[PDB]
Design a protein around this ligand. Structure first.
Ligand SMILES: CCCCOc1ccc([C@@H](C)NCCCNCCC(c2ccccc2)c2ccccc2)cc1OCCCC
Ligand SMILES: CCCCOc1ccc([C@@H](C)NCCCNCCC(c2ccccc2)c2ccccc2)cc1OCCCC
Ligand SMILES: [Ca+2]
Ligand SMILES: [Ca+2]
Ligand SMILES: [Ca+2]
Ligand SMILES: [Ca+2]
Length: 145
């Protein structure tokens, strides 16, 4: 089988966040920008290593099909939480355990992706379960898969 229309719509939007020029391919330069936007600072060598890991046709760049392949499977029951754990840590700017509407809005922004109040209000509402108005690690994990 395959992902739904909306599912596709979500993978493409996250792909466009790496593809700054919008030409359809992710370069090491475009990946670096994203890393720097996250406070991190990798080297050309490391950047190319990250790309080579998913470059199925080995042309030095990543495309949507290449991007989706790596997405549609953590191919690991172990070490998948080690990524979700870091993802959550990226958003929880104050390691308080709870992700707020402001931390989410703050991060999404640094990634050249300005949201709307209504958009930000829906991403949180949908993930919030305990009704505290914030997304804890628990809620975060389930929202992923
Ligand atoms: C999220 C959480 C986990 C994943 C899994 C499927 N990626 C496994 C490969 C780990 N190394 C490369 C990750 C790297 C990366 C992603 C795509 C292309 C090159 C590098 C990256 C950059 C920015 C934000 C997150 C990740 C993707 C996304
Ligand atoms: C990051 C790119 C999309 C992948 O992450 C996923 C994002 C949303 C889902 C679905 C099933 N859950 C939520 C439905 C869509 N509502 C928007 C959620 C929103 C979001 C939710 C909670 C907190 C902050 C944001 C969002 C948007 C874009 C990227 C990440 C998160 C599954 C994912 O898993 C698919 C990965 C392959 C197994
Ligand atoms: Ca590009
Ligand atoms: Ca490629
Ligand atoms: Ca927080
Ligand atoms: Ca909550």
């Amino acid at each position: 089988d395959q992902l739904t229309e909306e599912q596709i719509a979500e993978f493409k939007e996250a792909f466009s966040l790496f593809d700054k020029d919008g030409d359809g391919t992710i370069t090491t330069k475009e990946l670096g920008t994203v890393m720097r936007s996250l406070g991190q600072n990798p080297t050309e060598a490391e950047l190319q290593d990250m790309i080579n890991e998913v470059d199925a046709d080995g042309n030095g760049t990543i495309d949507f099909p290449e991007f989706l392949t790596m997405m549609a499977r953590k191919m690991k029951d172990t070490d998948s939480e080690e990524e979700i754990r870091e993802a959550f840590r990226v958003f929880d700017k104050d390691g308080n355990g709870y992700i707020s509407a402001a931390e989410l809005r703050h991060v999404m922004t640094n990634l050249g992706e300005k949201l709307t109040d209504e958009e930000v209000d829906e991403m949180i509402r949908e993930a919030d379960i305990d009704g505290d108005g914030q997304v804890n690690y628990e809620e975060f994990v389930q929202m992923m898969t």
